[PDB]
Amino acid sequence: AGKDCITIHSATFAWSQESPPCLHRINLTVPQGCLLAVVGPVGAGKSSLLSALLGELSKVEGFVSIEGAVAYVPQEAWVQNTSVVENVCFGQELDPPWLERVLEACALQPDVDSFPEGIHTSIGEQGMNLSGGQKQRLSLARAVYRKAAVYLLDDPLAALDAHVGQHVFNQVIGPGGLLQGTTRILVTHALHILPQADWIIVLANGAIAEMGSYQELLQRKGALVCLLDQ
């Protein structure tokens, strides 16, 4: 097995110290360099699990340790009142060939050619209007550009069309992609990428119900199969 990257140890979380817990006693380590899929019904706590790893919830009990710099792609993206390149670099030092590769992998190179200023086109309030899919892919591109070691991905490709979502997942997130050496935690509502993940975590009511690979949880006729039938 690979080295321990994320360790979540007897960890219980809530929105406040006095609130009833929203995540119940997580006990989990993620190996370094893997793609972990987090699935479960609506309200099972998939999004709050990433927020808990961001340190945004109040930890009632337990301990969390994460090895390496962490990048986050929210479910609802938003872009700054600036140009395309300033949105991707976002303070990071500019490296043109790496920017081109990131834009390419995130299915943004056609969109950039169509813009008048190219990568220097203003977006946001004063800038040009973007679609929901373009903002979401610009959001993922910003996280990829940072070259973090851990990626928390709150179903960033959900609304995208079929072939563009395939382009982005295949080039960025999945096996062989730009993030292949990183530890990726991918919450996903759609379930066709599950055979490409290394491990699957199924959550129920803010707790872990099942963990295994795709074939493991499939031959097991349990929570993942029940959700696939749903």
PDB file of C-alpha atoms in Angstrom:
ATOM      1  CA  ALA A   1       0.000   0.000   0.000  1.00  0.00           C
ATOM      2  CA  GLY A   2       1.000   3.612  -0.605  1.00  0.00           C
ATOM      3  CA  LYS A   3       2.179   6.086   2.014  1.00  0.00           C
ATOM      4  CA  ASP A   4      -0.343   7.687   4.384  1.00  0.00           C
ATOM      5  CA  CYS A   5      -1.350  11.095   2.975  1.00  0.00           C
ATOM      6  CA  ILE A   6      -4.547  12.069   4.837  1.00  0.00           C
ATOM      7  CA  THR A   7      -5.264  10.694   8.311  1.00  0.00           C
ATOM      8  CA  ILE A   8      -8.715  11.246   9.811  1.00  0.00           C
ATOM      9  CA  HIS A   9      -8.707   9.795  13.329  1.00  0.00           C
ATOM     10  CA  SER A  10     -11.855   9.474  15.493  1.00  0.00           C
ATOM     11  CA  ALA A  11     -12.974  12.770  13.963  1.00  0.00           C
ATOM     12  CA  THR A  12     -16.438  14.178  14.725  1.00  0.00           C
ATOM     13  CA  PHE A  13     -17.486  17.502  13.186  1.00  0.00           C
ATOM     14  CA  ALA A  14     -20.316  20.008  13.574  1.00  0.00           C
ATOM     15  CA  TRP A  15     -21.224  23.461  12.262  1.00  0.00           C
ATOM     16  CA  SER A  16     -20.564  24.780  15.787  1.00  0.00           C
ATOM     17  CA  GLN A  17     -19.126  23.277  18.967  1.00  0.00           C
ATOM     18  CA  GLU A  18     -22.634  23.048  20.473  1.00  0.00           C
ATOM     19  CA  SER A  19     -24.495  21.790  17.400  1.00  0.00           C
ATOM     20  CA  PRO A  20     -25.317  18.111  16.959  1.00  0.00           C
ATOM     21  CA  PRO A  21     -22.547  16.543  14.878  1.00  0.00           C
ATOM     22  CA  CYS A  22     -22.913  16.509  11.104  1.00  0.00           C
ATOM     23  CA  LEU A  23     -20.052  14.020  10.599  1.00  0.00           C
ATOM     24  CA  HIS A  24     -19.859  11.085  13.019  1.00  0.00           C
ATOM     25  CA  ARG A  25     -16.495   9.632  14.097  1.00  0.00           C
ATOM     26  CA  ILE A  26     -14.616   9.392  10.800  1.00  0.00           C
ATOM     27  CA  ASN A  27     -11.752   6.876  10.841  1.00  0.00           C
ATOM     28  CA  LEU A  28      -9.923   6.880   7.531  1.00  0.00           C
ATOM     29  CA  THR A  29      -6.555   7.261   5.858  1.00  0.00           C
ATOM     30  CA  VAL A  30      -6.169   8.047   2.160  1.00  0.00           C
ATOM     31  CA  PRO A  31      -2.990   6.729   0.489  1.00  0.00           C
ATOM     32  CA  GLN A  32      -0.845   9.226  -1.387  1.00  0.00           C
ATOM     33  CA  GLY A  33      -1.291   9.536  -5.137  1.00  0.00           C
ATOM     34  CA  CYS A  34      -4.712   7.889  -5.410  1.00  0.00           C
ATOM     35  CA  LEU A  35      -8.087   8.972  -6.735  1.00  0.00           C
ATOM     36  CA  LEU A  36     -10.705   8.444  -4.022  1.00  0.00           C
ATOM     37  CA  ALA A  37     -14.378   8.728  -4.950  1.00  0.00           C
ATOM     38  CA  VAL A  38     -16.850   9.890  -2.302  1.00  0.00           C
ATOM     39  CA  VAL A  39     -20.436   8.868  -3.088  1.00  0.00           C
ATOM     40  CA  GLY A  40     -23.739   8.640  -1.256  1.00  0.00           C
ATOM     41  CA  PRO A  41     -27.299   9.990  -1.357  1.00  0.00           C
ATOM     42  CA  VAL A  42     -28.131  13.679  -1.159  1.00  0.00           C
ATOM     43  CA  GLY A  43     -27.583  14.861   2.397  1.00  0.00           C
ATOM     44  CA  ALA A  44     -25.139  12.074   3.302  1.00  0.00           C
ATOM     45  CA  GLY A  45     -22.438  14.656   4.065  1.00  0.00           C
ATOM     46  CA  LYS A  46     -20.180  14.417   1.001  1.00  0.00           C
ATOM     47  CA  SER A  47     -19.686  18.183   0.692  1.00  0.00           C
ATOM     48  CA  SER A  48     -19.192  18.730   4.425  1.00  0.00           C
ATOM     49  CA  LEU A  49     -16.441  16.078   4.364  1.00  0.00           C
ATOM     50  CA  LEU A  50     -14.342  18.299   2.100  1.00  0.00           C
ATOM     51  CA  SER A  51     -15.194  21.341   4.222  1.00  0.00           C
ATOM     52  CA  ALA A  52     -14.044  19.441   7.308  1.00  0.00           C
ATOM     53  CA  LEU A  53     -10.713  18.731   5.592  1.00  0.00           C
ATOM     54  CA  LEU A  54     -10.464  22.456   4.801  1.00  0.00           C
ATOM     55  CA  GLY A  55     -10.712  23.169   8.537  1.00  0.00           C
ATOM     56  CA  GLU A  56     -13.996  25.051   8.074  1.00  0.00           C
ATOM     57  CA  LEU A  57     -16.072  23.057  10.569  1.00  0.00           C
ATOM     58  CA  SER A  58     -15.628  22.904  14.330  1.00  0.00           C
ATOM     59  CA  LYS A  59     -13.928  19.618  15.276  1.00  0.00           C
ATOM     60  CA  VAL A  60     -15.655  18.161  18.334  1.00  0.00           C
ATOM     61  CA  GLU A  61     -13.329  15.163  18.757  1.00  0.00           C
ATOM     62  CA  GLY A  62     -10.440  13.584  16.943  1.00  0.00           C
ATOM     63  CA  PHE A  63      -7.584  14.649  14.747  1.00  0.00           C
ATOM     64  CA  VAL A  64      -6.824  15.289  11.072  1.00  0.00           C
ATOM     65  CA  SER A  65      -3.438  15.500   9.351  1.00  0.00           C
ATOM     66  CA  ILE A  66      -2.824  16.213   5.674  1.00  0.00           C
ATOM     67  CA  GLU A  67       0.566  15.969   3.965  1.00  0.00           C
ATOM     68  CA  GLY A  68       1.099  18.633   1.312  1.00  0.00           C
ATOM     69  CA  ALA A  69      -0.470  21.770  -0.079  1.00  0.00           C
ATOM     70  CA  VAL A  70      -4.237  21.543  -0.564  1.00  0.00           C
ATOM     71  CA  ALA A  71      -6.265  22.969  -3.443  1.00  0.00           C
ATOM     72  CA  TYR A  72     -10.058  23.171  -3.528  1.00  0.00           C
ATOM     73  CA  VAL A  73     -12.580  23.332  -6.374  1.00  0.00           C
ATOM     74  CA  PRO A  74     -16.068  24.283  -5.103  1.00  0.00           C
ATOM     75  CA  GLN A  75     -19.317  22.978  -6.532  1.00  0.00           C
ATOM     76  CA  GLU A  76     -20.464  26.500  -7.472  1.00  0.00           C
ATOM     77  CA  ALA A  77     -17.570  28.360  -9.063  1.00  0.00           C
ATOM     78  CA  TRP A  78     -17.106  32.109  -9.310  1.00  0.00           C
ATOM     79  CA  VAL A  79     -14.464  34.206 -11.025  1.00  0.00           C
ATOM     80  CA  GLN A  80     -12.692  37.382  -9.984  1.00  0.00           C
ATOM     81  CA  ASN A  81     -13.192  40.799 -11.590  1.00  0.00           C
ATOM     82  CA  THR A  82     -10.127  40.345 -13.753  1.00  0.00           C
ATOM     83  CA  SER A  83      -8.684  38.676 -16.860  1.00  0.00           C
ATOM     84  CA  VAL A  84      -8.599  34.962 -17.697  1.00  0.00           C
ATOM     85  CA  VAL A  85      -4.899  34.542 -16.883  1.00  0.00           C
ATOM     86  CA  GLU A  86      -5.186  36.462 -13.610  1.00  0.00           C
ATOM     87  CA  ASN A  87      -8.062  34.156 -12.630  1.00  0.00           C
ATOM     88  CA  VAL A  88      -6.012  31.020 -13.294  1.00  0.00           C
ATOM     89  CA  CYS A  89      -2.666  32.183 -11.897  1.00  0.00           C
ATOM     90  CA  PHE A  90      -4.405  33.888  -8.950  1.00  0.00           C
ATOM     91  CA  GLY A  91      -1.149  35.147  -7.430  1.00  0.00           C
ATOM     92  CA  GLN A  92       1.017  32.244  -8.602  1.00  0.00           C
ATOM     93  CA  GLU A  93       4.006  33.100 -10.769  1.00  0.00           C
ATOM     94  CA  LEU A  94       3.227  33.160 -14.485  1.00  0.00           C
ATOM     95  CA  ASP A  95       4.631  30.265 -16.538  1.00  0.00           C
ATOM     96  CA  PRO A  96       3.287  30.465 -20.114  1.00  0.00           C
ATOM     97  CA  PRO A  97       3.811  26.863 -21.326  1.00  0.00           C
ATOM     98  CA  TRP A  98       2.299  25.507 -18.099  1.00  0.00           C
ATOM     99  CA  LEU A  99      -0.654  27.884 -18.446  1.00  0.00           C
ATOM    100  CA  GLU A 100      -1.241  26.650 -22.000  1.00  0.00           C
ATOM    101  CA  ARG A 101      -1.172  23.024 -20.848  1.00  0.00           C
ATOM    102  CA  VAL A 102      -3.637  23.743 -18.024  1.00  0.00           C
ATOM    103  CA  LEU A 103      -6.033  25.636 -20.299  1.00  0.00           C
ATOM    104  CA  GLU A 104      -5.762  22.762 -22.774  1.00  0.00           C
ATOM    105  CA  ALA A 105      -6.529  19.995 -20.278  1.00  0.00           C
ATOM    106  CA  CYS A 106      -9.516  21.909 -18.843  1.00  0.00           C
ATOM    107  CA  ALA A 107     -11.117  22.207 -22.333  1.00  0.00           C
ATOM    108  CA  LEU A 108     -10.600  25.974 -22.343  1.00  0.00           C
ATOM    109  CA  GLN A 109      -8.296  26.463 -25.344  1.00  0.00           C
ATOM    110  CA  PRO A 110     -11.201  26.748 -27.829  1.00  0.00           C
ATOM    111  CA  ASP A 111     -12.946  29.229 -25.523  1.00  0.00           C
ATOM    112  CA  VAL A 112      -9.761  31.305 -25.218  1.00  0.00           C
ATOM    113  CA  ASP A 113      -9.318  31.569 -29.000  1.00  0.00           C
ATOM    114  CA  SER A 114     -12.898  32.859 -29.261  1.00  0.00           C
ATOM    115  CA  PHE A 115     -12.226  35.655 -26.768  1.00  0.00           C
ATOM    116  CA  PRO A 116     -11.041  39.022 -28.140  1.00  0.00           C
ATOM    117  CA  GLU A 117      -8.132  39.504 -25.716  1.00  0.00           C
ATOM    118  CA  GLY A 118      -7.415  35.769 -25.505  1.00  0.00           C
ATOM    119  CA  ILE A 119      -6.109  34.976 -22.035  1.00  0.00           C
ATOM    120  CA  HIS A 120      -6.059  38.723 -21.290  1.00  0.00           C
ATOM    121  CA  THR A 121      -9.840  39.105 -21.646  1.00  0.00           C
ATOM    122  CA  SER A 122     -11.539  40.663 -18.633  1.00  0.00           C
ATOM    123  CA  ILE A 123     -14.218  38.551 -16.967  1.00  0.00           C
ATOM    124  CA  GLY A 124     -16.425  39.232 -13.979  1.00  0.00           C
ATOM    125  CA  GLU A 125     -18.611  42.307 -13.503  1.00  0.00           C
ATOM    126  CA  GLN A 126     -16.761  44.713 -15.802  1.00  0.00           C
ATOM    127  CA  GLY A 127     -15.675  41.798 -17.999  1.00  0.00           C
ATOM    128  CA  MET A 128     -17.187  39.426 -20.527  1.00  0.00           C
ATOM    129  CA  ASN A 129     -20.019  37.105 -19.514  1.00  0.00           C
ATOM    130  CA  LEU A 130     -19.195  33.414 -19.122  1.00  0.00           C
ATOM    131  CA  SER A 131     -21.318  30.292 -19.010  1.00  0.00           C
ATOM    132  CA  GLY A 132     -21.628  28.128 -15.920  1.00  0.00           C
ATOM    133  CA  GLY A 133     -19.431  25.501 -17.557  1.00  0.00           C
ATOM    134  CA  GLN A 134     -16.686  27.989 -18.414  1.00  0.00           C
ATOM    135  CA  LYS A 135     -16.572  29.342 -14.850  1.00  0.00           C
ATOM    136  CA  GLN A 136     -16.411  25.814 -13.457  1.00  0.00           C
ATOM    137  CA  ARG A 137     -13.560  24.834 -15.785  1.00  0.00           C
ATOM    138  CA  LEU A 138     -11.757  28.104 -15.062  1.00  0.00           C
ATOM    139  CA  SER A 139     -12.130  27.230 -11.369  1.00  0.00           C
ATOM    140  CA  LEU A 140     -10.580  23.777 -11.766  1.00  0.00           C
ATOM    141  CA  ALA A 141      -7.851  25.297 -13.952  1.00  0.00           C
ATOM    142  CA  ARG A 142      -6.914  27.672 -11.123  1.00  0.00           C
ATOM    143  CA  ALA A 143      -6.532  24.774  -8.682  1.00  0.00           C
ATOM    144  CA  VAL A 144      -4.530  22.687 -11.167  1.00  0.00           C
ATOM    145  CA  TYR A 145      -2.222  25.629 -11.904  1.00  0.00           C
ATOM    146  CA  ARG A 146      -1.145  25.765  -8.244  1.00  0.00           C
ATOM    147  CA  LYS A 147       0.470  22.290  -8.488  1.00  0.00           C
ATOM    148  CA  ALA A 148      -0.884  21.262  -5.101  1.00  0.00           C
ATOM    149  CA  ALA A 149      -0.348  17.815  -3.582  1.00  0.00           C
ATOM    150  CA  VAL A 150      -3.958  17.247  -2.411  1.00  0.00           C
ATOM    151  CA  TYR A 151      -7.084  18.092  -4.430  1.00  0.00           C
ATOM    152  CA  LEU A 152     -10.538  18.282  -2.837  1.00  0.00           C
ATOM    153  CA  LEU A 153     -13.051  18.278  -5.700  1.00  0.00           C
ATOM    154  CA  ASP A 154     -16.721  18.931  -4.854  1.00  0.00           C
ATOM    155  CA  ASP A 155     -18.167  17.410  -8.052  1.00  0.00           C
ATOM    156  CA  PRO A 156     -16.701  20.191 -10.234  1.00  0.00           C
ATOM    157  CA  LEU A 157     -17.730  18.622 -13.562  1.00  0.00           C
ATOM    158  CA  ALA A 158     -21.393  17.999 -12.738  1.00  0.00           C
ATOM    159  CA  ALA A 159     -23.221  20.446 -15.003  1.00  0.00           C
ATOM    160  CA  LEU A 160     -20.835  20.090 -17.972  1.00  0.00           C
ATOM    161  CA  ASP A 161     -22.021  18.455 -21.171  1.00  0.00           C
ATOM    162  CA  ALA A 162     -21.074  14.841 -21.802  1.00  0.00           C
ATOM    163  CA  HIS A 163     -18.050  15.163 -24.096  1.00  0.00           C
ATOM    164  CA  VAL A 164     -16.644  18.279 -22.395  1.00  0.00           C
ATOM    165  CA  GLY A 165     -16.947  16.596 -19.000  1.00  0.00           C
ATOM    166  CA  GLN A 166     -15.121  13.595 -20.444  1.00  0.00           C
ATOM    167  CA  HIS A 167     -12.390  15.849 -21.872  1.00  0.00           C
ATOM    168  CA  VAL A 168     -11.846  17.523 -18.516  1.00  0.00           C
ATOM    169  CA  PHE A 169     -11.969  14.439 -16.309  1.00  0.00           C
ATOM    170  CA  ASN A 170      -9.777  12.423 -18.684  1.00  0.00           C
ATOM    171  CA  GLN A 171      -7.064  15.061 -19.071  1.00  0.00           C
ATOM    172  CA  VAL A 172      -7.051  16.434 -15.505  1.00  0.00           C
ATOM    173  CA  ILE A 173      -8.549  14.170 -12.858  1.00  0.00           C
ATOM    174  CA  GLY A 174      -8.397  10.534 -13.953  1.00  0.00           C
ATOM    175  CA  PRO A 175      -5.608   8.039 -14.623  1.00  0.00           C
ATOM    176  CA  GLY A 176      -2.671   9.598 -16.457  1.00  0.00           C
ATOM    177  CA  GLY A 177      -4.094  13.118 -16.178  1.00  0.00           C
ATOM    178  CA  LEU A 178      -2.327  16.273 -15.053  1.00  0.00           C
ATOM    179  CA  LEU A 179      -3.107  15.455 -11.391  1.00  0.00           C
ATOM    180  CA  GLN A 180      -2.014  11.812 -11.588  1.00  0.00           C
ATOM    181  CA  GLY A 181       0.667  12.049  -8.932  1.00  0.00           C
ATOM    182  CA  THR A 182      -1.580  13.838  -6.414  1.00  0.00           C
ATOM    183  CA  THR A 183      -4.116  12.639  -3.849  1.00  0.00           C
ATOM    184  CA  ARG A 184      -7.564  13.485  -5.222  1.00  0.00           C
ATOM    185  CA  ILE A 185     -10.752  13.359  -3.143  1.00  0.00           C
ATOM    186  CA  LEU A 186     -13.586  13.512  -5.678  1.00  0.00           C
ATOM    187  CA  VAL A 187     -17.172  13.864  -4.546  1.00  0.00           C
ATOM    188  CA  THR A 188     -19.227  12.707  -7.518  1.00  0.00           C
ATOM    189  CA  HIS A 189     -22.999  12.490  -7.968  1.00  0.00           C
ATOM    190  CA  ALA A 190     -22.762  10.925 -11.420  1.00  0.00           C
ATOM    191  CA  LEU A 191     -21.309   7.433 -11.125  1.00  0.00           C
ATOM    192  CA  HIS A 192     -19.779   6.442 -14.476  1.00  0.00           C
ATOM    193  CA  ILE A 193     -16.251   7.501 -13.412  1.00  0.00           C
ATOM    194  CA  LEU A 194     -16.300   5.099 -10.433  1.00  0.00           C
ATOM    195  CA  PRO A 195     -14.395   2.265 -12.230  1.00  0.00           C
ATOM    196  CA  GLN A 196     -11.571   4.789 -12.835  1.00  0.00           C
ATOM    197  CA  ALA A 197     -11.174   5.614  -9.133  1.00  0.00           C
ATOM    198  CA  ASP A 198      -8.736   3.653  -6.992  1.00  0.00           C
ATOM    199  CA  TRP A 199     -10.963   3.579  -3.907  1.00  0.00           C
ATOM    200  CA  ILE A 200     -14.612   4.380  -3.236  1.00  0.00           C
ATOM    201  CA  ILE A 201     -16.072   5.706   0.023  1.00  0.00           C
ATOM    202  CA  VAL A 202     -19.860   5.434   0.409  1.00  0.00           C
ATOM    203  CA  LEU A 203     -21.399   7.711   3.053  1.00  0.00           C
ATOM    204  CA  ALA A 204     -24.746   7.441   4.821  1.00  0.00           C
ATOM    205  CA  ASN A 205     -26.101  10.116   7.185  1.00  0.00           C
ATOM    206  CA  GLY A 206     -22.712  11.730   7.748  1.00  0.00           C
ATOM    207  CA  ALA A 207     -20.837   8.466   8.346  1.00  0.00           C
ATOM    208  CA  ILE A 208     -18.866   5.940   6.329  1.00  0.00           C
ATOM    209  CA  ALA A 209     -20.957   2.911   5.331  1.00  0.00           C
ATOM    210  CA  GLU A 210     -18.585   1.105   2.913  1.00  0.00           C
ATOM    211  CA  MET A 211     -15.089   1.369   1.468  1.00  0.00           C
ATOM    212  CA  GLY A 212     -13.508  -0.566  -1.374  1.00  0.00           C
ATOM    213  CA  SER A 213     -12.479  -0.575  -4.998  1.00  0.00           C
ATOM    214  CA  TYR A 214     -15.078  -0.499  -7.765  1.00  0.00           C
ATOM    215  CA  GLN A 215     -15.192  -4.264  -8.354  1.00  0.00           C
ATOM    216  CA  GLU A 216     -15.079  -4.955  -4.599  1.00  0.00           C
ATOM    217  CA  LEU A 217     -18.126  -2.808  -3.862  1.00  0.00           C
ATOM    218  CA  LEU A 218     -19.883  -4.138  -6.974  1.00  0.00           C
ATOM    219  CA  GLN A 219     -19.660  -7.859  -6.195  1.00  0.00           C
ATOM    220  CA  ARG A 220     -20.684  -6.853  -2.707  1.00  0.00           C
ATOM    221  CA  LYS A 221     -24.395  -6.140  -3.163  1.00  0.00           C
ATOM    222  CA  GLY A 222     -24.520  -3.255  -0.740  1.00  0.00           C
ATOM    223  CA  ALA A 223     -24.583   0.521  -0.406  1.00  0.00           C
ATOM    224  CA  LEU A 224     -22.805   1.447  -3.643  1.00  0.00           C
ATOM    225  CA  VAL A 225     -24.927  -1.004  -5.642  1.00  0.00           C
ATOM    226  CA  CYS A 226     -28.056   0.325  -3.924  1.00  0.00           C
ATOM    227  CA  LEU A 227     -27.084   3.856  -4.928  1.00  0.00           C
ATOM    228  CA  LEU A 228     -26.283   2.767  -8.497  1.00  0.00           C
ATOM    229  CA  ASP A 229     -29.783   1.294  -8.689  1.00  0.00           C
ATOM    230  CA  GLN A 230     -31.026   4.699  -7.511  1.00  0.00           C
TER     231      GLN A 230
END
